[PDB]
Amino acid sequence: IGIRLTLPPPKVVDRWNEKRAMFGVYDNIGILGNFEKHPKELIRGPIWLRGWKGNELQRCIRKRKMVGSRMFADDLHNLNKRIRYLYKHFNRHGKFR
């Protein structure tokens, strides 16, 4: 019974809408534009992870460092608790030493 008895409504995808059609444009902004701009400057997203990557602990540390003062109170409390938990887990748990 864990199965739907009707076909789901058809999902139509426009492969040639503007977003898909122009996807990838300016990814070579650096090597084709005399390196005035780095391609990572094209990234739109959270201010604390534009052109940067890390595990959950590093992401949380960076978020606290960069926008911690602007965070809501309980969100910041949750982030502090999460950093503490992730520190304990990554530095004290695991199969490997």
Partner 1 sequence: YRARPPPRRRPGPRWPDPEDLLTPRWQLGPRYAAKQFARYGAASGVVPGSLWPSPEQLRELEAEEREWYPSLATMQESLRVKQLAEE
Partner 2 sequence: ARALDLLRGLPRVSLANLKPNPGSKKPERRPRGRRRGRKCGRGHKGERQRGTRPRLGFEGGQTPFYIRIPKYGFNEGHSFRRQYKPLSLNRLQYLIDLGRVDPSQPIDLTQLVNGRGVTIQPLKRDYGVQLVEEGADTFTAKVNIEVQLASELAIAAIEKNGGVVTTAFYDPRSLDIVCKPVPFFLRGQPIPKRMLPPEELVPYYTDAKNRGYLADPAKFPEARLELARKYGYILPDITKDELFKMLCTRKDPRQIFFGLAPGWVVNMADKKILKPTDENLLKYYTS
Partner 3 sequence: EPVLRKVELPVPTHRRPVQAWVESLRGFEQERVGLADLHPDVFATAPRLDILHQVAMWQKNFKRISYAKTKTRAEVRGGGRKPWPQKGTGRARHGSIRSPLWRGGGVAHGPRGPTSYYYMLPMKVRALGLKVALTVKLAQDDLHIMDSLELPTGDPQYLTELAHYRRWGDSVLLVDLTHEEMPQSIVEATSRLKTFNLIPAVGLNVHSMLKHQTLVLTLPTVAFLEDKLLWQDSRYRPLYPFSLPYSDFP
Q: How far is the CB of 28 from partner 2 (least distance, A)?
A: 17
Residue 10 is classified by DSSP as P
Residue type at 39 in one-letter notation: P
Per-residue x/- mask for partner 3, residues 8 to 27, rule CB under 8 A?
Answer: --------xx--xxxxxxxx
Please list, in sequence order, all residues whose beta carbon lies within 8 angstroms of the beta carbon of residue 86, skipping any fewer than 6 positions away.
56, 57, 60
Contact 65, 52 (CB under 8 A): no
**Comparison of 22 and 73: residue with beta carbon closer to partner 2:** 22
Least distance between partner 2 and beta carbon 54 (Å): 20
Longest dimension (CA), the chain: 61
Asked whether position 51 contacts partner 1 by CB under 8 A, the answer is: no
Name which of 53 and 97 has its Cβ closer to partner 3.
53
CA distance 83 to 75: 12
Q: Which residue ranges make up the site for partner 3 (CB under 8 A)?
A: 16-17, 20-36, 39-40, 42-43, 45-46, 49-53, 56, 59-60, 63, 78, 81-82, 85
